[PDB]
Amino acid sequence: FAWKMVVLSLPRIQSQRYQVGVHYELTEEEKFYRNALTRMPDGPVALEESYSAV
Amino acid sequence: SKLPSGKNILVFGEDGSGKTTLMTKLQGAEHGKKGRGLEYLYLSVHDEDRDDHTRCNVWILDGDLYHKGLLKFAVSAESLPETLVIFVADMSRPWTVMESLQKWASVLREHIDKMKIPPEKMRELERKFVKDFQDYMEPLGDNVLTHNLGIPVLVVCTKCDAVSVLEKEHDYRDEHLDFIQSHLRRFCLQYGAALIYTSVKEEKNLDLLYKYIVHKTYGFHFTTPALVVEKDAVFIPAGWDNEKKIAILHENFTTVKPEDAYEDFIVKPPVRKLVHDKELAAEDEQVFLMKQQSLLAKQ
């Protein structure tokens, strides 16, 4: 679990960050790259291959 | 004769519903970090009579259909009869609770056909679960246990401290609560499931949940009867309910019908649209200055 938090806890790029006042909180998907597993180029089988060794 | 081990816990729910923070307080750990994909944990189950300690592993699945292929490592074919399934529903967003239930049920139904179990073993398991349902103490019906899996299942409702936010800034009444509890009682009756209402902010039925897992996974003695009056601490175990214990909730229905669908009465609130598609698109220069050439010629 610690090796995947290096990428998965990276802060996302915020476009309109200069505005202030709106008291909404962005979710975890739009604050950090929590959809990086869906962008896996070989499909989810690399995560299956990673879990297979445990 | 030592106590059996290898008892499996299968947690299913949407992401952000608070499954990890529920499991770290059921187990007793301080910081349960929400690792994504699958989470691995075990339950500290022990008895004071035989002085024996049993390890019962916990498998948590995140709310993502892209990770539905991870279930092969969580449960196998041989680990199926030693698996107790907890289905997690979060009524903090009460508009989409049994949707997650039926989609995880369909996922479990297609996944239980993936290893191609022979028709004798799961029929024996279904017969065992049917006789365990019929022998509860404090043929079947038309819609009772019609979608049985053969293994003990459970539906646990989370954030019971989040009942007041439903009433105050959404203008909910007791008919609102009765409508959502009737549908899940129908689901529990259809699937042979139980219901424990639990809040971790208000610390309600957490040890009652823990004793229920210990009893349903190890045959421990159970004495707590069904609770229906306390709407924040509802306890409906397996075998208590029937087609007439759901009909008592239809008396307070003055504007809604029990036979109606779900999404017609309770609607999810519309949310903020990404209002940025107004954009700015300056024209191509060629057509723009042909138009300006026409304006040059016409005047």
B272 inside domain: no
B279 inside domain: no
Angle between helix B174-191 and B97-112 (nearest 10): 10
Sequence length of chain B is 299
CA B197 – CA B156 distance, rounded (Å): 6
B276 inside domain: no
Is-contact B188 B237, C-beta < 8 A?
no
B125 inside domain: yes
CA B45 – CA B51 distance, rounded (Å): 11
CA B132 – CA B219 distance, rounded (Å): 11
CA B59 – CA B80 distance, rounded (Å): 13
Query: Up-side HSE of residue B92: CA atoms within 13 Å toward CB?
Result: 15
Chain B residues close to A54, C-beta within 8 Å: 73
Is-contact B231 B91, C-beta < 8 A?
no
The long-range contacts involving B140-148, CB below 8 angstroms and separated by at least 24 positions, are B141/B189, B141/B242, B141/B243, B142/B243, B143/B186, B143/B189, B143/B190, B143/B243, B144/B189, B144/B190, B144/B192, B144/B242, B144/B243, B145/B189, B145/B190, B145/B191, B145/B192, B146/B190, B147/B105, B147/B109, B147/B190, B147/B191, B148/B191, B148/B192
What region, left, alpha or beta, does residue B71 occupy, with left being phi > 0 and alpha being psi -120 to 50 degrees?
alpha
Given an 8 Å threshold on Cβ–Cβ distance, is A44 in contact with B33? no
* Chains A–B, number of C-beta pairs less than 8 Å apart: 33
Residue type, B113: D
Q: Which residues contact A54 (CB under 8 A, 6 or more apart)?
A: B73
Query: Up-side HSE of residue A7: CA atoms within 13 Å toward CB?
Result: 10
B294 inside domain: no
Angle at B167 between CA B166 and CA B171, to 5 degrees: 105
Which residue in B283, B245, B212 sits closest to B9, CA to CA?
A: B212
CA B236 to each of CA B92, B154, B197, B227, B245: distance values in angstroms, whole numbers, following the listed order: 20, 10, 9, 7, 11
**Matching residue, tokens 């949310």:** B271
What token pair was written down for B37? Answer: 């994909």
For chain A, the residues whose C-beta falls within 8 A of a C-beta of chain B are 1, 4-5, 8, 24, 27-28, 34, 37-38, 44, 47-48, 51-52, 54
CA B265 – CA B99 distance, rounded (Å): 15
Residue type, B160: C
Is-contact B200 B238, C-beta < 8 A?
no
B211 inside domain: yes
What token pair was written down for B223? Answer: 């004495």
Binding residues of B: 13-20
* Exp. method: cryo-EM
Residue type, B151: I
B16 touches chain A (CB under 8 A): yes
Phi and psi torsions of B85, nearest 5° = -100, 125
Partner-chain residue, chosen from B66, B73, B272, that has the shortest CB–CB distance to A44: B66
| Domain tally, chain B | 1
Enclosing domain of residue B194: 4-266
First to last CA, chain A: 12
Q: Which ranges in chain A belong to alpha helices (H)? A: 5-8, 28-31, 45-52
Chain B residues close to A27, C-beta within 8 Å: 16
CA B184 – CA B197 distance, rounded (Å): 12
Q: Which residues contact B163 (CB under 8 A, 6 or more apart)?
A: B91, B177, B231, B232
Phi and psi torsions of B9, nearest 5° = -115, 125
CA B96 – CA B99 distance, rounded (Å): 6
Neighbour count for residue B38 (Cβ, 10 Å)? 18
B298 inside domain: no
Which residue in B185, B286, B195 sits closest to B233, CA to CA?
A: B195
CA A32 – CA A6 distance, rounded (Å): 11
HEC string of chain B equals: CCCCCCCEEEEECCCCCCHHHHHHHHHCCCCCCCCCCEEEEEEEEECCCCCCEEEEEEEEECCCHHHHHHHHHHCCCCCCCCEEEEEEEECCCHHHHHHHHHHHHHHHHHHHCCCCCCCCHHHHHHHHHHHHHHCCCCCCCCCCCCCCCCCCEEEEEECHHHHHHHHHCCCCCHHHHHHHHHHHHHHHHHHCCCEEECECCCCECHHHHHHHHHHHHHCCCCCCCCECCCCCCCEECCCCCCCCCCHHHHCCCCCCCCCCCCCCCCCCCCCCCCCCCCCCCCCCHHHHHHHHHHHHHHC
B103 inside domain: yes
- How are strands ordered across the β-sheet holding B83-90? B38-46, B53-61, B8-12, B83-90, B153-158, B195-197, B235-236
Chain A residues close to B35, C-beta within 8 Å: 1, 4-5
Name the DSSP class of A11: B
